[PDB]
Structures are given as structure tokens and as C-alpha cells.
Amino acid sequence: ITDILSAEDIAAALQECQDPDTFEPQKFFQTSGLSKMSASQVKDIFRFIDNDQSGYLDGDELKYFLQKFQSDARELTESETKSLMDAADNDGDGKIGADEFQEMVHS
């Protein structure tokens, strides 16, 4: 992830949602620089988060979202993982597909 995002933008993004329930998908994506990157770049990042390679984000992949940016970051709270899911899901399957992630990140 550090090959596409600046280390320092990532540190700032984590610093901003350091307390529980301060995580806000749009804020994170702006601070970190994600929302400014190309589809293909956003896709690479997706591939890094999708730990089991199912092609979708769901379950524990959401609880460990930040841990993909920095391995010692905190765990998202249940409310925060719910928020991510609400933010992204567009087809009622309770998981985040590559398409859904692209749209989310880009707004």
C-alpha cells in the first residue's frame, strides 16, 4: 500500500481516526490520498485488503481494514464496520466488490 500511497498521508489518516468510532470512510479516503488515485491503483489497494482473495471484502476483512495500512493500527469497531458496509454495499449481498470499492472511494 506504501508503494501507491505516501507513508506520511497514511500516518495522518490513522492519526485522524485514532479514537474508537472516529473512523469515517470519506475522511480516511481523502486524508490518505486514496480518493485521488486511478482505478487501477484503487484496484491494487483493494487486492491488498481482500485477504482471502475471494474478490470481496466481508467479515473480518473490515475489522482489520486499518491493519492493512499499518500492522499495529487498531481494529475497527462493530459500528465502524457497519458504517463501511452501509457506505459501499449497493446490491444487498453484505460484502464489498471491486466495483463497489471503486465507487465508494471516488465518492
Secondary structure element (H or E) that encloses residue 102, with its range: helix 98-105
Among 7, 22, 47, 52, the residue binding Ca ion under the rule CB under 5 A is: 52
Give residue 32's Cα distance to chain centre: 10
Among 31, 50, 69, 104, the residue binding Ca ion under the rule CB under 5 A is: 50
Among 40, 34, 50, 36, residue whose Cα is nearest residue 2: 34
What are the residues whose beta carbons fall under 8 Å from the beta carbon of 83, sequence distance 6 or more? Answer: 23, 24, 25
Task: Check the annotation: does 60 bind a ligand.
Answer: no
CB of 17 to Ca ion, least distance (A): 14
Task: Check the annotation: does 61 bind a ligand.
Answer: yes
Q: Check: CB of residue 21 under 8 Å from CB of residue 77.
A: yes
Under the binding rule (CB under 5 A), the answer on residue 89 touching Ca ion is yes
Distance linking the first and last C-alpha atoms of the chain:
20
Please work out the total of residues on this chain that contact Ca ion, with binding judged by CB under 5 A. Answer: 8
Under the binding rule (CB under 5 A), the answer on residue 19 touching Ca ion is no
Binding site listing for Ca(2+): 50, 52, 54, 56, 61, 89, 91, 93, 95, 100
Residues that bind Ca ion (CB under 5 A): 50, 52, 54, 70, 72, 89, 91, 93
